[PDB]
Design an enzyme around this catalytic site. Structure first.
Site, PDB file in Angstrom:
ATOM      1  CB  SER B 135     -79.952 -35.234  98.610  1.00  0.00           C
ATOM      2  OG  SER B 135     -79.606 -33.984  99.189  1.00  0.00           O
ATOM      3  CE  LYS B 161     -77.332 -34.135 100.996  1.00  0.00           C
ATOM      4  NZ  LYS B 161     -75.856 -34.182 100.899  1.00  0.00           N
ATOM      5  CG  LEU B 162     -84.622 -33.303 105.672  1.00  0.00           C
ATOM      6  CD1 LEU B 162     -85.226 -33.331 107.076  1.00  0.00           C
ATOM      7  CD2 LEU B 162     -85.716 -33.169 104.622  1.00  0.00           C
ATOM      8  CE  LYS B 163     -77.953 -30.314  99.670  1.00  0.00           C
ATOM      9  NZ  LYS B 163     -77.544 -31.353  98.700  1.00  0.00           N
ATOM     10  CG  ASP B 189     -75.632 -30.700 102.571  1.00  0.00           C
ATOM     11  OD1 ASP B 189     -74.822 -29.898 102.994  1.00  0.00           O
ATOM     12  OD2 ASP B 189     -75.433 -31.380 101.452  1.00  0.00           O
ATOM     13  CG  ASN B 191     -74.586 -27.765 100.285  1.00  0.00           C
ATOM     14  OD1 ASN B 191     -75.714 -28.186 100.036  1.00  0.00           O
ATOM     15  ND2 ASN B 191     -73.466 -28.488 100.160  1.00  0.00           N
ATOM     16  CD  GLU B 214     -73.347 -33.486 103.420  1.00  0.00           C
ATOM     17  OE1 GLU B 214     -74.386 -34.128 103.553  1.00  0.00           O
ATOM     18  OE2 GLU B 214     -72.769 -33.250 102.252  1.00  0.00           O
ATOM     19  CG  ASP B 239     -69.858 -32.341 100.603  1.00  0.00           C
ATOM     20  OD1 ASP B 239     -68.926 -32.377  99.816  1.00  0.00           O
ATOM     21  OD2 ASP B 239     -71.126 -32.379 100.182  1.00  0.00           O
ATOM     22  CE  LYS B 263     -70.852 -33.901  97.714  1.00  0.00           C
ATOM     23  NZ  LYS B 263     -71.851 -32.997  97.155  1.00  0.00           N
ATOM     24  N   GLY B 291     -73.340 -37.248  96.495  1.00  0.00           N
ATOM     25  CA  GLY B 291     -73.742 -37.260  95.105  1.00  0.00           C
ATOM     26  C   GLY B 291     -73.771 -35.877  94.512  1.00  0.00           C
ATOM     27  CB  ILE B 293     -77.109 -33.751  90.370  1.00  0.00           C
ATOM     28  CG1 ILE B 293     -77.556 -33.136  91.685  1.00  0.00           C
ATOM     29  CG2 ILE B 293     -78.227 -33.669  89.340  1.00  0.00           C
ATOM     30  CD1 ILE B 293     -77.759 -31.630  91.549  1.00  0.00           C
TER      31      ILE B 293
HETATM   32  O1  LIG Z   1     -76.794 -36.169  93.312  1.00  0.00           O
HETATM   33  C1  LIG Z   1     -77.467 -36.674  94.234  1.00  0.00           C
HETATM   34  O2  LIG Z   1     -77.863 -37.858  94.133  1.00  0.00           O
HETATM   35  C2  LIG Z   1     -77.784 -35.823  95.468  1.00  0.00           C
HETATM   36  C3  LIG Z   1     -77.355 -34.390  95.157  1.00  0.00           C
HETATM   37  C4  LIG Z   1     -76.594 -33.827  96.321  1.00  0.00           C
HETATM   38  O3  LIG Z   1     -77.146 -33.684  97.411  1.00  0.00           O
HETATM   39  N1  LIG Z   1     -75.334 -33.265  96.102  1.00  0.00           N
HETATM   40  C5  LIG Z   1     -75.334 -31.821  95.999  1.00  0.00           C
HETATM   41  C6  LIG Z   1     -74.504 -31.327  97.163  1.00  0.00           C
HETATM   42  O4  LIG Z   1     -74.413 -30.102  97.371  1.00  0.00           O
HETATM   43  O5  LIG Z   1     -73.975 -32.124  97.975  1.00  0.00           O
HETATM   44  C7  LIG Z   1     -74.873 -31.328  94.678  1.00  0.00           C
HETATM   45  C8  LIG Z   1     -75.462 -31.732  93.471  1.00  0.00           C
HETATM   46  C9  LIG Z   1     -74.999 -31.255  92.239  1.00  0.00           C
HETATM   47  C10 LIG Z   1     -73.930 -30.359  92.204  1.00  0.00           C
HETATM   48  C11 LIG Z   1     -73.345 -29.942  93.401  1.00  0.00           C
HETATM   49  C12 LIG Z   1     -73.818 -30.416  94.629  1.00  0.00           C
END
Ligand SMILES: O=C(O)CCC(=O)N[C@@H](C(=O)O)c1ccccc1
Ligand SMILES: O=C(O)CCC(=O)N[C@@H](C(=O)O)c1ccccc1
Ligand SMILES: O=C(O)CCC(=O)N[C@@H](C(=O)O)c1ccccc1
Ligand SMILES: O=C(O)CCC(=O)N[C@@H](C(=O)O)c1ccccc1
Ligand SMILES: O=C(O)CCC(=O)N[C@@H](C(=O)O)c1ccccc1
Ligand SMILES: O=C(O)CCC(=O)N[C@@H](C(=O)O)c1ccccc1
Lengths: 367, 367, 368, 367
Positions: B135, B161-163, B189, B191, B214, B239, B263, B291, B293
């Site tokens: 990500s 994957k690109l924020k 993504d 969000n 996403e 998501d 998730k 994920g 993190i």
């Molecule tokens: O954790 C990873 O390996 C990738 C992190 C990721 O993209 N998840 C993001 C999300 O918004 O989806 C995230 C990470 C930490 C806490 C909340 C969201």
């Protein structure tokens, strides 16, 4: 685990009393049992096929041949084996769900027994006992039926399911409702005996408040059930048509079913059955456990499965004696209209050699 | 099982580099960890909440509170406890999925460990390793980003994957497609960054050929999504909206989603997660593991989960070192772009205390 | 009229070339043939199962057993038999469509011969010859594929169908379109090898102008095909899924299919096959005849079938020699890329005794 | 075969009692008969037109003309004629189904006789006798009506069909039901006499439990039927509208019909009629054989047709005498509410010249 081999065994168990469905009468029960052998231990599986292909295309001799020539061998070939891996391992072979379900069951019994885990635990059980209904066959007479019904009723059976056929529907129903009352849990099972064109006859059942009508049309007729659903008041329940979780989702999406009967063998195993359950739950579709006149072996596993959260209606999990004077495992006894969920690892049951040997007709080792 | 108590830790891991999302930038990850103590042994849980309420209404302190005051006690008060039973036991408490999931996770870990069963085993894994993608965040610049991307590509990551967010969409995308190629697994993504009215903008990426977009709009905007799916070429992936297996069924049935990001914490636990997987699978909807993190604790569970059959797209199962310099468990190491599934009981991993203590900011025993 | 018995024979025929599909590679054909005996004379049926259940749940040994123990006995117990009554008489037995189709085939041939009528006449043929396509399997190399295809094209085949699977889709297609042009009738067949999740890859075939993509998804996944159809430009064609005229109607209604592959054995017999043709026709859905590497027996019945009005696309009705060096009946030879519809009574063909006996591996008489 | 020629013969047969429908009263039946001649032998065809275009646009003279000048000439022009080929050979001529159907019939009779095959074998008959209903016209008096109805019931007819019309619908029905009971199979036929706006009136029949309401609206009004189906409980049955297998499919899809009356001439032939039956069957739509007051020739073909599998409701295939004191062939005599399926080749019946001669009005030979 490493699969060492599988012992296939034919068993014949006489029925306590002839069991008649729209596909015929049954006085004895011919079944296929599997004994999986791991360097570690054994696991038991039961096939739900009957002698001839009357409920489904699968039958005893057929299941034996496929297991023998195709399925067992494929698993034996696999380096490391897991109940979950069975599926993928046997995917190349089209159909033969019952046979596959039986093998997976055997494998799973062994695998769990090894982790010292019960079927119930693995499946996600939320309770320790389950309410049991009973499946009542087609009678020669109404009075005959009534005694029978009343009988089960006294035994403590929670729900009454009546096998129906053309010429054995509304009356028998009318009779039980009348005599037995309006608060009996009552449903019918056509075992695919009708056609869309019979809607009106079945609509004639509208007034008796049955929980459902099970598999009125042929297995393949999903859209037909959806249509039928639109012509009757009685909720549609599918059995034969539900060969998988995907089958379940499709039927639900299509408006062809409101309640689903889950028969593990029919769907290819207890793992898939679990999937069926979850899929139905996710769509707000209640499920109930179906029965295939199993030995304490399948009975045990089914009781475990029936303890799942979405099994919101009593299933066809009657006590051992409803069919068999003598079970090959310790019997299942109705205690307050319920059955206790087994506690040991794996199935929580095992055949009593003595008894088994008594009913075994054939045996073969596959390694 | 019998729950003895839970110990709650606050931990603070320092991110290799700050990770910028549509909700805010990240420099240090503040996590909430759980140690469930039973007769037999213990289990670990990991909460995916964050410092404050930006991805969701749940956050570190609220989670702690609910757990401490509502959730943990509920389980403590139980006789037998199984991870499955956790759900029913906590059902009276509305929401708090992340908290419940973490708790459930800790319990499961302890249960499996007692049966010497791995998560993967329990979950029905069929694969031994999983393809990992990464990500990529919101860059302050292009090259910046083009570099990183290029960087991750190098290490073995199979998908990018690109924020995204208004002002960081088509350009960034345009640039990577351009620079790195077209045969790269790329996806974005938002969000919840956009709105239906933003459609035309998001239409702008049609061209690029992304695996999916996403969560383009709010959590609650399902219909919006389906509509939106109508006004764009890029497959909708959800998501945030996917809060449960039912949620998934609904979104699917409404044509609001084609691929689902799973998730575990967002849906309330690995168990529900598995069902989401099964539901999607029954509807032909591919899934991939999302994920948060996490440490090697959530990472291990994710990896196991990600090895299930329907996870047909590489997950956010990036190596330990992607975010963390020093994990609190053996780290995870890419290899051919894969991560190996943990073979040990329960999570198959556990925290190295010094490591752990170095990061712990607080504890509380709950008994 | 009244069934005297049925002979069940096992036969093994070497392929001139190994045939590979998504479900595997075949170098020999193992078949189940039936010789039905009636007072009015004998008829021949051919079962389309293979050795193991790889294309479907049915397989040689299975079919033989069911015929032997359930189906044949049931027809023998009847007072009267007609090909038409075969279905109702065997309806109590679930599934086993291939087995049943073979049995109905044998009865129908004897029956038709007795009336000195051909299958074509019986089925409602409107044409005296049919355009033939060829089914090409998965190759080891593209060049290899390019040659084979080139050879067929040379033989005069009117259409090329390519067996595909994951890792043998776009390229081979591209290669052939590349080499042979856009004018060639070209189509692919996955034999269920894909999943809905694979839409994008499949969508890559769009640019090749394929006639259709056949059975991309699993047999039971009808709705997924309707969904897939929405995702791709290549027309969906179903094979495995079409187990009956009702199955075709349902898939049609659900928009899961645009073109139907009809296989008599798969649907339970030539009679049901006609019904599928008719149902499709009523819905404006074109059909074509599928093949199962049959001997001249099934090939002949297929040719007849394929001459029906709605069979508007070339079928999998290749010359005998595409598979067999030596067929057991008079061989079918391509002429102008066509095959002539048989003219005699029944199948219009029959096995050459010495030829058949040579490939025969087992035989059994099933009488009352 | 090669067609040598055809003899077109006009016939007039007096009815035992006038027959009144919504389009009028019939006292005498004016038919058109075809005697096909081929090198091998002959075959007889029967056209269902009437003197005037009151049931459909086709009428006796029109039929004769098109046959003479267009149809027949086209068949004579072909080298090889087969029943199946008649269609393609006559395809350029729009419409004129009844006329085409008559010709096909004669050709098919000759063709089958040549192979010594009955119409039933060709059509795919599964039964040897068929249950018969009777069509009862509009009466002047209700009492006249009950008398007639009780008479037919007394003769053993299995089902009663009533012609209805505005001003003769509820009453008649109410009365028969009152008189004869709820167990009688009863249905009605408007022959297109109502309009969508007459819905409340028709709804008034709901209480009476009719099997169906036949062709309430005009021929071209399919959608109207679909709509009407919505407002009334009585199942809709189409006759006039069903001019072909495709029309049946369409109507079925549009929800405009639940039961289909199949009339061979209407649809352009027994061959097409078989297709309709099959199309209907595939959609779960029951069919029944319609009647056109035919001589023993058509009667014969109809009886064979009606013995097909999806003809699950009694047809308008009454005994010869229901209309004709003296039929031109061996007469059909009701037995146990049934008529036997003919066993001979082709029709399995032929005209008795002597008789035929008496009722012949005109005759021509087309060579
Ligand atoms: O954790 C990873 O390996 C990738 C992190 C990721 O993209 N998840 C993001 C999300 O918004 O989806 C995230 C990470 C930490 C806490 C909340 C969201
Ligand atoms: O209680 C039971 O175990 C049997 C209940 C029952 O009705 N089983 C039927 C069925 O069709 O569902 C059955 C039994 C055996 C074999 C096939 C079917
Ligand atoms: O039919 C026979 O008598 C021998 C053939 C036979 O037993 N087939 C068996 C087998 O066990 O080999 C079989 C094959 C397929 C299905 C069922 C049974
Ligand atoms: O028979 C032919 O000409 C081509 C055969 C062909 O492609 N059939 C394949 C198929 O999947 O359709 C097949 C052959 C044999 C058995 C099963 C399947
Ligand atoms: O109207 C007339 O009396 C002269 C023409 C006539 O009979 N028309 C015929 C014919 O037989 O030629 C006809 C044409 C069309 C339709 C019916 C009849
Ligand atoms: O029983 C019969 O043969 C006649 C049944 C009947 O009602 N026929 C009517 C009709 O409207 O269908 C009819 C007769 C002759 C001509 C046209 C129509």
């Amino acid at each position: 685990m490493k699969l060492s081999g599988v012992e296939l065994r034919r068993v014949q168990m006489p029925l306590v009393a002839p069991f008649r469905t729209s596909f015929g009468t049954q006085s004895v029960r011919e079944l296929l049992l599997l004994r999986a052998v791991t360097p570690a231990g054994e696991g038991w599986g039961e096939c739900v096929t009957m002698a001839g292909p009357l409920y489904s295309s699968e039958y005893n001799d057929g299941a034996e041949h496929v297991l023998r020539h195709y399925l067992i061998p494929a698993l034996l070939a696999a380096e490391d084996i897991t109940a979950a891996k069975v599926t993928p391992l046997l995917a190349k072979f089209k159909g033969h769900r019952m046979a596959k379900g039986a093998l997976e069951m055997a494998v799973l019994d062994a695998e769990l027994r090894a982790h010292e885990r019960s079927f119930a635990a693995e499946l996600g059980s939320v309770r320790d006992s389950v309410p049991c209904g009973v499946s009542v066959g087609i009678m020669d007479t109404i009075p005959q039926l009534l005694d029978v019904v009343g009988g089960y009723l006294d035994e403590g059976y929670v729900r009454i399911k009546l096998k129906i056929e053309p010429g054995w529907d509304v009356e028998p129903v009318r009779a039980v409702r009348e005599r037995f009352g309006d608060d009996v849990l009552l449903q019918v099972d056509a075992n695919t005996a009708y056609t869309l064109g019979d809607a009106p006859q079945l609509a004639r059942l509208d007034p008796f408040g049955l929980l459902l009508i099970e598999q009125p049309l042929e297995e393949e007729d999903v859209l037909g059930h959806a249509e039928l659903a639109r012509r009757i008041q009685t909720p549609i329940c599918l059995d034969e048509s539900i060969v998988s979780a995907r089958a379940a989702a499709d039927a639900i999406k299509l408006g062809a079913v409101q309640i689903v009967n889950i028969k593990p063998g029919r769907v290819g195993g207890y793992l898939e059955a679990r999937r069926v359950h979850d899929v139905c739950a996710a769509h707000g579709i209640p499920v109930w456990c179906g029965g295939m006149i199993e030995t304490g072996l399948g009975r045990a596993a089914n009781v475990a499965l029936a303890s799942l959260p979405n099994f919101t209606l009593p299933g066809d999990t009657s006590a051992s004696d409803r069919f068999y004077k003598t079970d090959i495992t310790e019997p299942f006894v109705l205690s307050g209209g319920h059955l206790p969920v087994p506690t040991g690892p794996g199935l929580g049951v095992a055949p009593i050699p003595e008894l088994l040997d008594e009913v075994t007709t054939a045996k073969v080792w596959i390694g």
